[PDB]
């Protein structure tokens, strides 16, 4: 722990938890949001026999544990799970006590207000954090980009959000949430791999196939033409070496998996591709600034490490929108940490401690005070 009473910066992103100290450039403890529980009961002795397993421990013990998600698309299952994982993060991973450091947290866009009230109340009772602040990840990604104008595409693991912000002003009237995310990607890839001869249901293979998505997946420039040329495609077809050692070969599926977000009709969504959701979002607001939105679009999330989103994005928007002004996307490398960086940025300036949510305000007005203290 630093000698100074600097604040805690924790991004509880929908899919990854990244925690550390204020003034740091990158979060120190970063782990996926999976939680493992003993698949069977206790009869043995001498070691183990522990209920909750979180972090890399559960990653190593994936096979023996039922792998469960305490949060999915924002919905909260069991607050005890968050209690334990935050205990682990603060003491076993961050080696910090929350008594002496206020916490800045980031929440998924348009999270329930009742969810905020309950989570804040359990937090304040269970923990002894001196002060509090929670913010939407959209403005955090904006801060990471450091440009007040643009539309943020936050692609988490449970929801994809499109949020327009002009000159550092939120536009909730033009903000939308789409239920397509990593979960859907894994599902669709699971069914295609089932049609390829490999049919698995458990979560270990879920992580294997999301790793495959991280490594080999394409974003098709032209879809049906690329499957037409991918009929044989000995060179274009790509293989992976699974940890057991078998060589699993995939061809068109590499660019037929992310395509589903662009083409939701593959597995039955009324909503069109996410580019349509950015398009409608843009036109909902006044006409004039729309061009700037076209030229200032930002994309954020862990998924963004994949190739192909930028070219597809610009080409389709230019197809939909007039091609007079030039559209260009901006995306700094390793932007999944960017939100946490913005949290540090929030703690950088000396005005931030004017609106810390202190203990006594919550003791006076209950959780309801946040309704007036954040917004």
């Amino acid at each position: 722990d630093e000698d100074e009473t600097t604040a805690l910066v924790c991004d509880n992103g929908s899919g990854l938890v990244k925690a550390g100290f204020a003034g740091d450039d990158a979060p120190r403890a970063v782990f996926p949001s999976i939680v493992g529980r003993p698949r069977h009961q206790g009869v043995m002795v001498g070691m183990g026999q522990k209920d909750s397993y979180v972090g890399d421990e559960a990653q190593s013990k994936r096979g023996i544990l039922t792998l469960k998600y305490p949060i999915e698309h924002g919905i909260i299952t069991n607050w005890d799970d968050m209690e334990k994982i935050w205990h682990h993060t603060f003491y076993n991973e961050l080696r910090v006590a929350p008594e002496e450091h206020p916490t800045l947290l980031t929440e998924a866009p348009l999270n329930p207000k009742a969810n905020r009230e309950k989570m804040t109340q359990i937090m304040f009772e269970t923990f002894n954090v001196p002060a509090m602040y929670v913010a939407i990840q959209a403005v955090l990604s904006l801060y990471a980009s450091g440009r007040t104008t643009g539309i943020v595409l936050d692609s988490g693991d449970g929801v994809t959000h499109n949020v327009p912000i002009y000159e550092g002003y939120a536009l909730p009237h033009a903000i939308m949430r789409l239920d397509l995310a990593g979960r859907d990607l894994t599902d669709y890839l699971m069914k295609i791999l089932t049609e390829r001869g490999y049919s698995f249901v458990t979560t270990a293979e879920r992580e294997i196939v999301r790793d495959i998505k991280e490594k080999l997946c394409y974003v098709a420039l032209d879809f049906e033409n690329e499957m037409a040329t991918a009929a044989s495609s000995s060179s274009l077809e790509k293989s992976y070496e699974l940890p057991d050692g078998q060589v699993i070969t995939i061809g068109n599926e590499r660019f037929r998996c992310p395509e589903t977000l662009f083409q939701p009709s593959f597995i039955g969504m009324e909503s069109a591709g996410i580019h349509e959701t950015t398009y409608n979002s843009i036109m909902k607001c006044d006409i004039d600034i729309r061009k700037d939105l076209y030229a200032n679009n930002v994309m954020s999330g862990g998924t963004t490490m994949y190739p192909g989103i930028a070219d597809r994005m610009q080409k389709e928007i230019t197809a939909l929108a007039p091609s007079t002004m030039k559209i260009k996307i901006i995306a700094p490398p390793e932007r999944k940490y960017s939100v946490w960086i913005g949290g540090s940025i929030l703690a950088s300036l000396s005005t931030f401690q004017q609106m810390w949510i202190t203990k006594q305000e919550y003791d006076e007005a209950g959780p309801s005070i946040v309704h007036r203290k954040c917004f």
Partner: protein, 63 residues
Amino acid sequence: DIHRKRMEKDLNELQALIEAHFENRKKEEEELVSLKDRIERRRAERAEQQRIRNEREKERQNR
């Protein structure tokens, strides 16, 4: 104002790039020297085991 600060920190990481190189290069040189000494270690071990098997053979006919 915040954005220039980011431009600067990335620059910090950028030069840090070479600093990330240094530990990898020392580890590479350590592997270098370990393999090079393993060369003569393997050769001497082969000679030693040949002598040991010679003693094995002489004890074999001696019984």
